Amino acid sequence: YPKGPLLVLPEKIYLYSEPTVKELLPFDVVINVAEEAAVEYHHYRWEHDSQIALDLPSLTSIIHAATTKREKILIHCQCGLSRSATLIIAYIMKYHNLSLRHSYDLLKSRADKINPSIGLIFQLMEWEVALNA
């Protein structure tokens, strides 16, 4: 397990899990994707994994808006690293026009412990088709 929020991408995107009030301090945008619970803050509570697909344009749009503002963005769940990884991968796929394989590989290489479900991987396949159409 970690060592504080993890810088996973050069554009200052951070991955983590259930931070403290002290650990949320350096961030300008926070995305919380955990199931239950200064400045820009977003909270999605998907009970089911199948629900992510509808929120991908908005969520990846939010992340990209953060990088355009050159801001530190934190994306976290608990414990749990499936939905948040999926989200980061969906962002890379769209805004860096990279394949699912490459996007996953990039994130994997930096955050070894990630494992989105097969459900979420199929979701990302669906996302790719929607990007190429």
CATH code for position 23: 3.90.190.10
Please state the residue numbers annotated as binding site for 4-O-phospho-L-tyrosine: 48
The H-or-E segment that residue 14 falls in is strand 13-17
| Method in brief | X-ray
Options 62, 77, 90, 114, the catalytic residue: 77
Which amino acids are annotated as binding site, given as ranges? 48
Number of domains in the chain: 1
Structural domain that includes position 25: 1-133
Q: Are 59 and 5 in contact (CB under 8 A)?
A: no
DSSP characters over 56-109: HHHHHHHHHHHHHTT--EEEEESS--SHHHHHHHHHHHHHTT--HHHHHHHHHH
Residue 23 · residue 12 · CB < 8 Å: no
Per the annotation, the verdict on 77 as an active-site residue is yes
